[PDB]
Amino acid sequence: NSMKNIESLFDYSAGQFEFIDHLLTMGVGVHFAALIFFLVVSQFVAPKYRIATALSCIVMVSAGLILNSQAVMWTDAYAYVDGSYQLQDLTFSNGYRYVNWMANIPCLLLQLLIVLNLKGKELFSTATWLILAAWGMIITGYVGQLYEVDDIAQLMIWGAVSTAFFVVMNWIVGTKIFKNRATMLGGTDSTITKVFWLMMFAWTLYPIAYLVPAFMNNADGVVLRQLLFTIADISSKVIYGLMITYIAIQQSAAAGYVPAQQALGRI
Ligand SMILES: *C/C=C(C)/C=C/C=C(C)/C=C/C1=C(C)CCCC1(C)C
Ligand SMILES: CCCCCCCC/C=C\CCCCCCCC(=O)O
Ligand SMILES: [Cl-]
Ligand SMILES: [Cl-]
């Protein structure tokens, strides 16, 4: 897949190359720092919601590992030769992110369903439809990106199909959020709508990143895409995870769980 991606087409200045390495490395640190926070804080979440914080830990590690791997793959792929970072071998590709999404997107959605107070059959069926829609979106996008170098029209049609799945997934998310807001405790009925908007914003960055080959096919475009994934990853995983956990603790306290109450009170 490395020859199928635009990164393989260029030599990089030291500035471009190092900035990309630094973005990815910084992303690793952010996710792992957040992982410690979610871990320590899970003790203050009621059993009914605790799986949500646990899912944030799994997401932080999954994301951090993939970012770590991307950083090593990048440094393995290029060597500074004759004044520029030049491709030495086929080690780098964005495909690994997509594969990872097959696991992370379902986790991110499930945590949302949990704090929404869905349970039993509704939880199971909603999770099923959502993950199918997510998988449809990710798989079609993965295929489309295989054509970013030699067939832009194909990247676009796979993108369109993928976008249909995204739109339908968003409809399910939005509908469940807006219809279940009233069940939310401790003022979280307000907070949860912000979570919806945050997802719409952050998730929308990925398709933009996906289209960079069509509109900025050059080395600075490669930098821009990595920058966009970095903003998106932190918003969709970390900020989103902190909001989910806040909602979970807040609901836990309102429901009578003492450790949550002590926690909010100690701060
Ligand atoms: C933690 C990672 C997340 C939240 C990834 C989200 C990815 C998307 C919403 C991807 C969407 C895409 C489209 C809607 C069309 C182009 C192909 C994709 C898969 C990038
Ligand atoms: C919401 C999460 C925020 C993510 C923070 C990302 C940190 C970097 C932000 C801006 C730095 C831009 C400077 C780019 C200089 C380009 C160097 C080059 O390519 O030659
Ligand atoms: Cl409980
Ligand atoms: Cl990921």
Numbering used by the authors: -1 to 265
Authors' description from the paper:
In contrast, the NTQ rhodopsin functions as a light-driven inward chloride pump (called ClR). Here we report the atomic crystal structure of ClR from the flavobacterium Nonlabens marinus S1-08T. The structure reveals two chloride ion-binding sites, one at the active centre of the pump and the other on a loop in the cytoplasmic side, suggesting the pathway of chloride ion movement in ClR. The ClR structure comprises a short N-terminal helix, seven transmembrane helices (TM A–TM G), a C-terminal helix and three loops connecting the transmembrane helices on both extracellular and cytosolic sides.
Because Asn98 and Thr102 are the only residues of ClR directly interacting with Cl−-I, we investigated whether the interaction between Asn98 or Thr102 and Cl−-I is essential for the chloride-pumping activity of ClR. We expressed several ClR mutants (N98A, N98D and N98L for Asn98; and T102D, T102N and T102V for Thr102) in Escherichia coli cells. Of the mutants, T102N retained ∼70% of its pumping activity compared with the wild-type protein, whereas T102D completely lost its pumping activity. T102N's absorption spectra showed a blue shift in 1.5 M NaCl (λmax from 562 to 529 nm) suggesting that a chloride ion can bind at PSB but T102D's absorption spectra did not change in 1.5 M NaCl. We crystallized T102N and T102D proteins and collected diffraction data. Taken together, these results show that the direct hydrogen bond between Asn98/Thr102 (Asn98 and Thr102) and Cl−-I is crucial for the binding of Cl−-I, as well as for the chloride-pumping activity of ClR.
